[PDB]
Each structure stands twice: as structure tokens, then as C-alpha cells.
Write a protein that binds this ligand. Structure first.
Ligand SMILES: CCC(CC)O[C@@H]1CC(C(=O)O)=C[C@]2(SC(=N)NC2=O)[C@H]1NC(C)=O
Ligand SMILES: CCC(CC)O[C@@H]1CC(C(=O)O)=C[C@]2(SC(=N)NC2=O)[C@H]1NC(C)=O
Ligand SMILES: CCC(CC)O[C@@H]1CC(C(=O)O)=C[C@]2(SC(=N)NC2=O)[C@H]1NC(C)=O
Ligand SMILES: CCC(CC)O[C@@H]1CC(C(=O)O)=C[C@]2(SC(=N)NC2=O)[C@H]1NC(C)=O
Ligand SMILES: [Ca+2]
Ligand SMILES: [Ca+2]
Ligand SMILES: [Ca+2]
Ligand SMILES: [Ca+2]
Lengths: 390, 390, 390, 390
């Protein structure tokens, strides 16, 4: 049976902890994959953690993490959420140095992108087998969400980018059923930049909060209809939520265009709440460190600077990283709305820490009807590791 | 289908061994979690061992167990009873430095408490996802059973405490269906102290034997009706069963109030048997060492000092620890009553042993219609470990 | 649905390899249990390997195998046949320093015996939970098959012994349904000695070939009817098949009493074939080394010395050990008879080899309609191990 | 339900990556089997990787790979495709130093060959148990596909060879249902040599592209009908695809007989495409290094030298090895044709590399409707390993 996923997102006053994997602490002695970009998507049965593998293990020489991001050894695999990305619980997903995953109620559909930068190929798996393909259409590092895709009434949608990572690139919306491409669309967005979208279903559409890696310290926003007509622009909120970025005092909002005039960025997320928004961001303005989530009254529709809530999940003395969105399917939560949730990646190792490798663990939070106290569920592993003195 | 769990507990003459996990012996070379407080609860299919994880492994530096009990790295996970708490068989349950778990016949409901001491949050999972929340209502280390909760006809009940660990605190009874809170109650118990309840179903109610960590060397007792009306007080039996405590000769019973005038304590259990009781306790009066279980004729209802049975499962030359109760569901045992069972935790390491860490394994016993010979199924691992000489 | 298991055993011309686990070779670097006495029993779905665990791992100090056979750390666990007894595939079965297992078509019933030598307790599990108990009735190391038990039309039967291991002891037949004891019987066998029976179903009865550890170099034989009436005596065949034993030339057969006038022994097996028998035995007359299986025309019913077939599975330059019987259930083989099969244990370490430990792996063979060439599927691990130089 | 597998193979313009296991990289620190000859076959649910095990682990002394190919320790086991051949995900299949596997829609049928060179035995498993046997009929290393067998409407077929590996040998076609042999056939092929067939279903027959290890640098081809009538000969294409072999310029095609006049060879594959063929081959003419796949217009039926496509999956600076064919079952792909796919083995260690061992990993590719860019998904592990300096 297909998941409807046509409900509204739940109005939430705060976030409760779902899971923490302790991959890197466990990785001190256990067999764990070196990873970046874990992420959660949920079937009507379970939410799993997907992750990019470097073909290697923590505390092993192959954890030489100075051997490429887009290496030919990168695979997407997955475990049940909370479990660590260890070999022996891992289920294989796709060859991918960039991926997205989601479930339509019957099976899982993943998308793996591998191949060379000049002509990358994206394989679409469904039910555990390749079913369709998307080639690079712009010749420059084809890529996608690095977070959960979205399924509504049997059709799944996701966002892909092909082009420069720091200038005008090209941005596309693909749509598929049972692992088969059935519609696509170009996104007209000149001056704007779209990367690594975090999407979710809301009111029978797909809402996406992504990353401007060109000139925007605010976040591009995408709203996709089943017919692949769309609205796109920036999260109206008068508070910047990318990293890096400047102070809140020095920033003015926009619905239409990028603000802050800064490059780089980090993958992040946001949740519409009527006209309000929950926006995650690192505590540091300059470092992938700390993590907080702010509610902004009318942040979805106005240049609002009205902060009505604020919750911390990673204190600023600790390393953060990527963040993305997913929903609790109705069939699991038992709600009449879509429970909004997020994961936060915690990167350890290079560049900031003095070791030969780089990996990450995660914690997962989920929207509740209550204000939840600030705390820090940081990664916690002690650096450097054994092979760090080799 | 919901488990009725409205039957009476079986009258038992003794206890037979269910399982022993050998986690720590196995942990010498295998990948095992550092743990405290394992415990058993059973679905209509299997009984699992739940446990608190320190985010770390035996024989690894992160087993630095001088890094907090209520650390942000503590998760509840579970394996099938008898299996060891190893990474690769572990199923993730909740973020929790204190937990309880139980099954209602359809799914598992766990409760994880994490967050800071001043404002702890308890997440209630059901079917593998967060469904409801309980915040700290008294600002002081919110906490609960550390043993199996109880389900009757679809509604699950458990006991929580918020307050001082060595003085008057506050004590609450929560009740839930399908992971959703549907009723709660304050327990009026002035002069008394309730901690870490071991409960079970009996005659369609929840009977709880808990821990007085204030002034009681006898055990507080709680009897909960579906409507959350209750009786509470102390196990009548004229024999003390907490640790520490004084000699039996020097002790007088009470139904109403604490006796022995001593602080501290250890989590323990007891089983009503008509008017009699089976009470577990450490053999030592002063040490978490040895473990025995006594039947006291009319110990549930009178100040009786009539010891009619006595069985040993851990001899006094060996380390014990926590103990708790659960029942064999009818659907598994094939009985017309509820088979009473217990687990016993066996703590190795600090404080008593000379190492850098502390963990534990368990053995599980189950009520039978026969007198069963005394023996010792002690932990058995050899201390210190490799990383102990580091 | 209950397995009928009322068919006849297949007439077989030889034996084909089912599985080999390589536990000890794999145990050089992997996490494997130290074990003795693996054995196979089959459900309508899978045949598993059961085994006794020492609570410890190969290549670890706890593999100090100078720490008792009947230690309080011994558990029965199981994996799918062919897999090695590693921690992470292991399913927990019972606390047991001696065990038996079998399936009735709906669930598994195991029997674990633990407790002290003077008053041992046998726990009977069914569906993963304790259901009934047998206490020591003779005060002297209560024990049983160390091989698969037998189920016919829902009732399972097995053989137990309580008494001296080298003189007249007592021998009992228990019978159970759904994990509940429903009939028992004493075996009158004066001058005879019964140990470690290898049984199977044949023509709607249970046939058992066991071990005389008193004075017999031939094997005691037991035929059990559903009503627990029985015949017992010795395998008629005029060839001895225990270890140790003397030469074949120097031996005369018996149906009634023990022959060879030698003590000790080793667990072994045999399969009726009309009036003939397949009998396994070590190649050495004095060592648990090599392994062969002989067909003796009319060996089941006469003092025959007519060797009509001979097949080798372990050459004499290699170590053998225990052997036992089981059948392929009809539901798996697709035959109209019961396919006879056996496992052979391969003991490495003390006493014969120079190491600090003792474990074993197995190979499994199964009766076919063809003559199968001799070979040696020996254990193959290289002794001593790492911890052997410690 | 039986898989029809009577459809035509899909016309494909290129190949997309299915999976890569990284076994050897992972094997640096994890517990992985030493293997040769992995291969894929698919059930209606999953495609698994089968592999030959040396009874040992990477980075362990038993990885002494100077201890025989046809050792008594070799077992076939399997994991889900993409997963690595690690112990803890491994499912046991058969005792085999040469194997084939396939699924008929209800269960798996494997075939293990073990025993001595002079009289080898092949065991046929079905549903996890031995069901039938094939003895050596020519006394000289009985053997088979080392790749997926084929099932059509419930009957499975595969090819076996018994005889000299470098001269005229004997070649047989076996056919079975539910694990039971129901028809066989001798292949008349004088002057020709058949080894290690890679087969698939196509138009309701079994097409096989195999290996001439006698005098052929082109590949023998076999087309089998349900009645075991057959055509056999050589892949017509005017381009040689074995290793070793000479230059393409120096080669003339044949449908009937071997060409190139060279010995040795390597297991390979090919896919009919109407009258065209996709043929895999190593890039090197003399080394098991690099890997490419060529489409030859009318290569199936004519001496064509018309190269219309060319795709690289392993660049020539890297080691390749065996390759074989399988199909995506309709029930998984959702196509109306049979999706053609292949795996490529990547051998590391002896003979070419300076270590004490030899193993391999794989990548899996699958036919798509699009031209897919060349790349190299090579093995990637760094040689030598730890035990390499021992
Ligand atoms: C601008 C975003 C993309 C574009 C290549 O780059 C990702 C940046 C990045 C980071 O930590 O910031 C990690 C990466 S690495 C990777 N495998 N996935 C990522 O998201 C970069 N993405 C790719 C496809 O290489
Ligand atoms: C008085 C009981 C509680 C109250 C905090 O303290 C537990 C004591 C204790 C022990 O071994 O005795 C172990 C602890 S540590 C833990 N994670 N669980 C426990 O039961 C303490 N409980 C908490 C929530 O910290
Ligand atoms: C005479 C057979 C029994 C009687 C105690 O002794 C077993 C002998 C033995 C061996 O290798 O020969 C191994 C033992 S050790 C064990 N756990 N299982 C065995 O079969 C012995 N049995 C017991 C219950 O200790
Ligand atoms: C000529 C092909 C066969 C005939 C024995 O030999 C195989 C050659 C070979 C290789 O790498 O080329 C690997 C082997 S080793 C093995 N276990 N499987 C193989 O395919 C050889 N086959 C056998 C049954 O020994
Ligand atoms: Ca930016
Ligand atoms: Ca106390
Ligand atoms: Ca004897
Ligand atoms: Ca050749």
C-alpha cells in the first residue's frame, strides 16, 4: 500500500531525542565504517540511517581520509536508526559518492550517483535493484539531496544539481514511481544557488530547504507540486541560518534572493509551521560547531525577526555539521499529521581535529507538543585514535 | 492482539535458570557494550534483555567509566535474552541514562530519559518511534524503574520519581496506550521513598516492589489498579531485603513505614504468593555480593519471620547488584497463570575491583513447581582486562 | 503443524557432505566461541548446529580451558548449520553443561542441564522459554544425549542418565509435548551402561545408539515405542565401534551384553538399515582420530562380520571426536523416507595438542543413494594459536 | 511460484553500477573471508553474492594462500549483493571448491563439488538441504560454472566439466527440479574446450558463454533447449575476448571452432543482443587487469568486427579477473524483458602482488537503456597487509 503522505506537518513546540548512534566512540574498538552525511528516511515500519561509506573502517589505515570524497569506493548503505554504521548490520544500497533515499509504502527507492566528475551517473534502485538512470546533463559533478527524498501517493520526488559549486549552476526536479522516472523539470533560478536539499511532505506538496553555496547565508526554499510546477526563492525569515554567515543584527531578510553576500555553506533544514518556521543552524557563525533550532513567528512568509522559541541539541564546544529533514509516517506515529524530525551529523577528524581521518555520528530529534530543555548530545569520542599515532 | 495479562502469578517452589549472557567474559575479546542495569521484558514471542549503554566497548579506552552515569552517551538498546549486549545483535531503543520497557501484545513501548539533571526529558517510544513525552516536574533527576514495565489489556503502567535520591522526593504513576499518555497520578508517601520499581501483573493489577534510598532497609510496595487508585507502603515481611541493611535478628517488620534506619540501597524485587512473598536480596548485608531468594509465609500481609524456602543463585564470594521482575506471558509458557521470573545483574569493575571501568552481565531465573538446588552462576570474567594495564 | 516423523529411514549407499563450519580456522582471527559437542537437529525449515559454550572466545585468555567442563559458564546456543559458533549469529538456548535439542514441527524444544554435580537441574525450554524441569534423581551428574532428540507426531523423547560414569548407573526415558513432561520410564539394564545417546526416528519409533563407558567396546542400542515400552541391549554387529577398543579380529558380537572388556568410550552413532547397520567409529582403536562409517550386512540383528561398504570422512592423521545422528525431515528433503545424517566433531587442543585450550569444529554428512568417495574434511586449523605463546 | 524466466533479454546501450563490496579494503580491519570467484544470482526477492571461502580470514595466518585451491576447507557461502563476504552476514551453502547457484522462484538450489581430484562429488542442495548427487564420471577434477545457473519454469540447468584443463575433456549438461536430477546430456565437442560457463535465460532457452582453456582465445558458446538438445560452438564475433589472447588486428572470427591458438584463459561472459553481442574482457591481452565490455554488431551470428559501443568499468592500471552473467528477474525489475547483468571479480595478492595471500572483491553492473560513462570502480585496497610483514 502506498503512503498517502498528504497530511500537514505537526505544529511542534520543541524537539525530543529519537536516537544517537555513538558510531565513532564505538568505532574506537568495533568495526565501523568511516562515513559522512548520515541521514534518516522512514518506511511504514522503520526509520533507517543511510550513510556514505569510504569503503573503509575506523582505526584502519584505509581511513586515510586524504584519498578523495568522490572516490570510486563510496557506497550508500543503511542500518536501523540508532544503530551505528557497522559492517555487520549494514544493508547495501547503491554505489554513490552522493545519494538520496525514501520509501513509498511498498518498497525503498534509493539513488546513487557515482562515475567521474565530467559525466556522473545516477542509478535509481527500487526494491533492492537498479530500475532507472539519470546521466550528468551539465558535465560538472551531478549531485543531490544527501538527505531523505519524499513520497506522496506513490510518486517520489527529489532535487538534483549539476554545475559549479560556487557560482550559477543548474537545478532540476525529478519525479518517479516504482523506481521509474515519469517526469522532470528545470528550475529557473538565476542569481540563486541550490544544493543538498532537505525536503519533506507538507499539505500534499514537497517543501525543500536547501543550501546556497554561492552568495547566500540565508537558505533557498522550494515548494513542489505533484505536476512539477513550483515556487522557489529564499526562506523569508530575517535571520540567517547557513554556515558561514554574519551576525543576526547585521542581516536583512528576503523572500526572493540571496542575502549576506558570503560563499560556502553547510547543508541544513527548516520546517514550515503555518507562516512560521523552525530553522536549524550551527551555533557558531563561522564553524561547523554547536547546533540549535529556532522558531521564527511568520518566518516562512515575512522578513520576521521574531524569535519565539530556541532549543539547543549540541553545545558550541562541540562539532556539528550537516542536518536534514524527514517525517514520521502516519502509520508509525499514529498521528493525523506528519511529525517533523531531523538528524544532525557530528563530524570528527580533519580538517578541525588533528588526525588522519574524518568521520561522523548523528543524533535524531523529533517534533513534540512540548518545550524540551536544551542539552548537548555531542559525539563524544576521544581524538586522536590508535592509527592516529601510526 | 493485546495481551490480557490479567491472570494470577504462579505459585512457585523455586527458580530454574533461563539464561546467562557471559557478556563480560565474552567482552574480553568480542565487541560488547559497557553496561549497567540489564533487564528482561517479554513480548508474546520473545523475552529480550534491555540495557543501558555507555556509548562504549569493553577493552577500549572509552570504557573510561570515570566519565559520568548520566552521560549524554547513554542509550537503551536490547538483544534477545541470553545473548550478550554486543553491537551487532543490538537493536536501538532510546536515548536514556535511565529507562523502562514493556510490550502490550502488538508492539514494544520503551521510555528513555535523557537531558540535564535540572530538567530531564523522558521520551516514550512505541513501535520503534517517539510518541509522547514526560518532562521533569520537580527539577531533580527524573527517573524510573530500570526494569520491565507492565501491560494489562492494552494499557501499560510504570512508576517514575523526580527529586532527591536520599530524602523525601516525589513519586508518580504514569499510564499509557499505544505509546500515548492517558492518565497519571501522584503517590502520597510522606516519610517514604520510592526508587527503581520492579513490577509485574498479578490478578489484573500492577504490583511493585521498589527501593527506599532514604531510611528504609525494607522495601516499599505499590499496588496499582487500572484507574490509578493505589495502595502503597512497605513489604510486611519481618525480614529486611535491601542493601545495605542490618541483621535479621535485629529487625522488626512493618506494613506501613520504613524500618532499619539506614540510607542507600540497591534495586531489588519480590513476588506475592497469596499472602506469602518471594524476596530477593544480596547475601551480604553490606555488599552487592552473593544473591539469594527467600519465601516468607505470610510475608505479604504480616510481620512474618517464617522462612519456608531458601535458594541461592550467586554465592557470596561473587559480585551481584541490581535485580528486577518480569512475567512470562501466557502465550509463550502455555500456563493459565503468570510465571514469575527475575534477572540478576552482576557488576564487575569499580568501585570494588581494581580496573578503569564498570560493567555487568546477568542471569535469568524463572519460577517452577519444584525446589531447585542452590548453586552459583556468577559472572566469571577475570579482572583486570587488557586496557586495565594501559 | 506437527512433523509426522513416522516414516522409515532411507536405505543409503554412502554419505555426501552437508556442511563444514571451519570454526577454529575462522576462530584464529574472528570472534568464535570455545566449544565442545556441536550437533545438528532440523526444523521443517532449517537444520541448526547446537553447541556447548565455555562462556569464552578463541584466542582469548578466558579460553583457559583448564577451568572446568561442568562450569557455571556453559550455555547451549545455536546457529544455522555450516555457520560457525560465532557470537553474532548465535541464538541463545539454555544454561547447560550438557544438552539435547529437537523440533516438533511448530517450535524448538531444548533441554539444558546445569547446577551442581550432586543435585543437577535440567530445564526444558520450548518456543524460547522454560516450560518444565527434571531434577537429579540419583545425585550424580545428571546428563543426556549431547545430540539431537526425537519428535514423532508432537511428542518428543530423549534419554537421560544419572549416576557413575564408569560403573552401573541409572538410565531414564523422558517424553514431552509442547515442552511439558507427560511420561517417563526407568530402563532396566544391569551390567550395561548407557551414555550420550544418538537417536533418530525409524518406522514410528525412536532408535538410539549410545555409549558404554563401563565395560563395552560395542554400543548399547535402544528402541523406544510411543508408550515408553522399550527394547535395549547391544548393537548385534560383530565389529566393535567405540573408542577405545581392540582389533576387529579379536572381537565377538553380542545382542545382549557388553563386549571387549574395556572402559572409557566416545559418543557415537549408528543407523539401522533393515537388518543391516551403518556404524561410525574413529579410525584409531585407541585415539579420537580419523573417522569412518561402515555398513554391516545384518549388523542390526545378527553377530555379522560382513562388511559391505566403507567410507572415510576424516583421515587418521587428523583428530576426530564425538558423532551423533539426526534426520532430514520430509518437509525439507522431499523424500518419502527419513534421510539419515550425521555430524562429526573435530577436537583441537588439549589433551593431545600443545595449547592452553580445547575446542572443536564439525562436518555434516547425509545419506545418499550413491557410493561416495573417501576423503578427509579435517578441521585444518594450525596449532598453537596467538594466546598459546602467552 | 516458479519464475517463468522465458522472456527475452533487454537490449541495452550500456551498464550502470549495481554494487561494490569493498571486501578487501574492509578486510584490512574487519572479519572477512578470503575468497575467489564471487558471483551473483537473484531470487524474486534479492540478488545475493555467492563466493568460495578458504575457511579463513583476511589479515590472519590461515590466509596462507599457498595451501591449495581445491582444499578440503573450501565452502560456498553467500551474502546479499553489495555486502562483503564477512562471517557474520554469511549464510552457509555447500562444501565446494567449485560451485554454481540459482533460484527457481520458490527456493535456492546450489551445487557444491568437493572430494578428491580423482573422484570428486557434487552435492545438490535445495531449500538449504542436500537433495541429489553427481559423481565424477571421468576421474579428473569434476567442476562447473563458478557463476549463476539458470532456471526456467521450475527446471534449472547448468554445465559441468570433467577432464583435463588444457586438452580435450568431457562436457555435460545437467537439468533439475526442486533439487532433483531429471535429465542429463553429453556435449559432443571434439577439438573444443568448455569451462566455467556464464549462462542466462534468453527467449526460453539457456545461453552460455564459457572458457576455452585448450587452444581458444575466442569463447565457446552453448544454447540449451528445455529438452537438452543443444547447439554449441564459438562466439562468431571477429574479436577475441579471453585472456590471454593476441591483438584484434591479428585475429579472425569463427562460429565453429577455436581461434588464436593459445592456451590458458579466464572465466568470462557475453550477452546476445539479437544478432549482436556484449562481450566482456580484460583490457590487457596478457594480464587479468582492466575490464571493458564491447558491443559487436552481428557478433552473435557473423564474423563481425563492427564495434558499435565500448564501456570501461576497471581501468588497466588495476587488477581484474573472473566475470560472469546473471539476469534481473521480472518480479524485481518490473520489466517485460530479462535485464542482463554481470559481476567482475577483482583479484588482489599472489601471483601478481607481493603478499602471502590471494583474495578478491567485486563490482556489479546492470544493463540500461542509456550509454554510461567509462570509469574505474577498482578494488582499491592497499597491499601488502599486516600479516604481510609477518
Ligand atoms: C557544494 C556542495 C557539494 C557540491 C559538490 O559538495 C559537498 C560538500 C561537502 C561538505 O562537507 O561541505 C561534502 C560532500 S562529499 C560527499 N560525498 N558528499 C558531500 O556532500 C560534497 N559533495 C560532493 C558530491 O562531493
Ligand atoms: C537512588 C537511585 C538512582 C537515583 C538517581 O541512582 C541510581 C543509582 C545507581 C546505582 O548503582 O545504585 C545507578 C544508576 S545510574 C543509571 N544510569 N542508572 C542507575 O540506576 C543511578 N540512577 C541514575 C538515574 O543515575
Ligand atoms: C561418560 C560421559 C560423560 C559423563 C559425565 O562425560 C562427558 C565426557 C566428555 C568427553 O569428552 O568424553 C565430555 C563431556 S563435558 C560436557 N560438557 N559434555 C560432555 O559430553 C562429559 N560430560 C559431562 C556432562 O561432563
Ligand atoms: C581451467 C579452469 C579450472 C579447471 C580446474 O581451474 C580453475 C582455475 C582458476 C583460475 O583462477 O584460473 C581457479 C579455480 S580454483 C577454484 N576453486 N575455482 C576456480 O575456478 C580453478 N578451478 C578449480 C576447480 O580448481
Ligand atoms: Ca552559503
Ligand atoms: Ca535503603
Ligand atoms: Ca566404552
Ligand atoms: Ca583460452
Amino acid at each position: 500500500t502506498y503512503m498517502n503522505n498528504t497530511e500537514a506537518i505537526c505544529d511542534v513546540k520543541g524537539f525530543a531525542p529519537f536516537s544517537k548512534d555513538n558510531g565513532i566512540r564505538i568505532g574506537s574498538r568495533g568495526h565501523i565504517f568511516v562515513i559522512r552525511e548520515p541521514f534518516v528516511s522512514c518506511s511504514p515500519i522503520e526509520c533507517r540511517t543511510f550513510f556514505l561509506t569510504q569503503g573503509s573502517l575506523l582505526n584502519d589505515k584505509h581511513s586515510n581520509g586524504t584519498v578523495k570524497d568522490r572516490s570510486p569506493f563510496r557506497t550508500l548503505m543503511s542500518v536501523e536508526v540508532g544503530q551505528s554504521p557497522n559492517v555487520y548490520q549494514a544493508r547495501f544500497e547503491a554505489v554513490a559518492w552522493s545519494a538520496t533515499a525514501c520509501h513509498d509504502g511498498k518498497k525503498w527507492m534509493t539513488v546513487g550517483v557515482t562515475g567521474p566528475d565530467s559525466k556522473a551517473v545516477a542509478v535509481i534502485h527500487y526494491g533492492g535493484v537498479p530500475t532507472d538512470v539519470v546521466n550528468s546533463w551539465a558535465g560538472d559533478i551531478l549531485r543531490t539531496q544527501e538527505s531523505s527524498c519524499t513520497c506522496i501517493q506513490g510518486d517520489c520526488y527529489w532535487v538534483m544539481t549539476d554545475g559549479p559549486a560556487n557560482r550559477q549552476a543548474q537545478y532540476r526536479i525529478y519525479k518517479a514511481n516504482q523506481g521509474r522516472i515519469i517526469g522532470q523539470a528545470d528550475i529557473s533560478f538565476n542569481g540563486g544557488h541550490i544544493e543538498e536539499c532537505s525536503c519533506y511532505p507538507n499539505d500534499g506538496k514537497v517543501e525543500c530547504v536547501c543550501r546556497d553555496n554561492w552568495t547566500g547565508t540565508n537558505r533557498p526554499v522550494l515548494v513542489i507540486s505533484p505536476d512539477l510546477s513550483y515556487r522557489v526563492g529564499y526562506l523569508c525569515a530575517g535571520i540567517p541560518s547557513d554556515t558561514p554567515r554574519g551576525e543576526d543584527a547585521q542581516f536583512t531578510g528576503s523572500c526572493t534572493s540571496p542575502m549576506g553576500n558570503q560563499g560556502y555553506g553547510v547543508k541544513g533544514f527548516g520546517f514550515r509551521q503555518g507562516t512560521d518556521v523552525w530553522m536549524g543552524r550551527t551555533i557558531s557563525r563561522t564553524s561547523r560547531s554547536g547546533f540549535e533550532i529556532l522558531r521564527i513567528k511568520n518566518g516562512w512568509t515575512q522578513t520576521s525577526k521574531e524569535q519565539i522559541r530556541k532549543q539547543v541539541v549540541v553545545d558550541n564546544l562541540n562539532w556539528s555539521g550537516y542536518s536534514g529533514s524527514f517525517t514520521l509516517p502516519v502509520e508509525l506515529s499514529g498521528k493525523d499529521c506528519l511529525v517533523p524530525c531531523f538528524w544532525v551529523e557530528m563530524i570528527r577528524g580533519k580538517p578541525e581535529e588533528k588526525t588522519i581521518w574524518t568521520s561522523s555520528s548523528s543524533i535524531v530529534m523529533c517534533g513534540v507538543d512540548y518545550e524540551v530543555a536544551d542539552w548537548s548530545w555531542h559525539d563524544g569520542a576521544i581524538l586522536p585514535f590508535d592509527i592516529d599515532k601510526m
